[PDB]
Amino acid sequence: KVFGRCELAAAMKRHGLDNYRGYSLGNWVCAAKFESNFNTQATNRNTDGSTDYGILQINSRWWCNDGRTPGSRNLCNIPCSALLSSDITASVNCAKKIVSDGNGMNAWVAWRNRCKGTDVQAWIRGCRL
Numbered sequence: 001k002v003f004g005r006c007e008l009a010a011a012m013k014r015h016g017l018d019n020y021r022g023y024s025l026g027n028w029v030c031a032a033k034f035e036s037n038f039n040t041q042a043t044n045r046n047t048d049g050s051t052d053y054g055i056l057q058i059n060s061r062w063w064c065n066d067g068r069t070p071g072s073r074n075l076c077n078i079p080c081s082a083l084l085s086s087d088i089t090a091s092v093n094c095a096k097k098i099v100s101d102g103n104g105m106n107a108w109v110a111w112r113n114r115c116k117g118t119d120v121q122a123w124i125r126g127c128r129l
């Protein structure tokens with residue numbers, strides 16, 4: 001599914017992400033924009049052989065199982081395919097664990113390079129929330 005901007009803001013708020021770990025909704029929407037362009041089915045192979053999945057490009061090295069990432073873990077206890085569903089619950093649940101891991105949203109390199117410190121409220125501007 002390709003979400004619209006305000007549509008994803010609303011879904012993320014219903015699933016408890018707004019202000020989670022102190023990160024406002026616009027930070028989450030901005031991270032999803034640059035990680036996946038709001039497409040739940042986005043997948044991208046990393047240099048190391050791991051793969052990033054879903055709207056928040058969650059990596060199989062640590063977080064999910066795809067069966068083809070040696071030596072990796074599965075800390076969200078999910079198949080990585082769950083992260084490609086039109087229902088964002090598994091991506092949000094797993095993102096909550098990632099953003100609690102110590103480095104906040106810096107775990108998403110596109111957030112650090114494209115969102116951090118910018119006017120992220122623009123991402124929710126206009127949305128009936």
Ligand SMILES: [Cl-]
Pocket residue numbers: 005033
């Ligand atoms: Cl947009």
Ligand SMILES: [Cl-]
Pocket residue numbers: 010011012014
């Ligand atoms: Cl919703």
Ligand SMILES: [Cl-]
Pocket residue numbers: 011014
């Ligand atoms: Cl929804």
Ligand SMILES: [Cl-]
Pocket residue numbers: 014
């Ligand atoms: Cl709904």
Ligand SMILES: [Cl-]
Pocket residue numbers: 024025026027120121122124
């Ligand atoms: Cl915001």
Ligand SMILES: [Cl-]
Pocket residue numbers: 046047048
């Ligand atoms: Cl990498």
Ligand SMILES: [Cl-]
Pocket residue numbers: 065066067068069070071072
């Ligand atoms: Cl694996």
Ligand SMILES: [Cl-]
Pocket residue numbers: 065
């Ligand atoms: Cl398995």
Ligand SMILES: [Cl-]
Pocket residue numbers: 073074075
């Ligand atoms: Cl594990």
Ligand SMILES: [Cl-]
Pocket residue numbers: 079
């Ligand atoms: Cl499975």
Ligand SMILES: [Cl-]
Pocket residue numbers: 065078079080
């Ligand atoms: Cl599995």
Ligand SMILES: [Cl-]
Pocket residue numbers: 065066067079
């Ligand atoms: Cl599996």
Ligand SMILES: [Cl-]
Pocket residue numbers: none
């Ligand atoms: Cl399994």
Ligand SMILES: [Cl-]
Pocket residue numbers: none
């Ligand atoms: Cl399985």
Ligand SMILES: [Cl-]
Pocket residue numbers: 011086087088089
């Ligand atoms: Cl949803």
Ligand SMILES: [Cl-]
Pocket residue numbers: 011087088
């Ligand atoms: Cl939903």
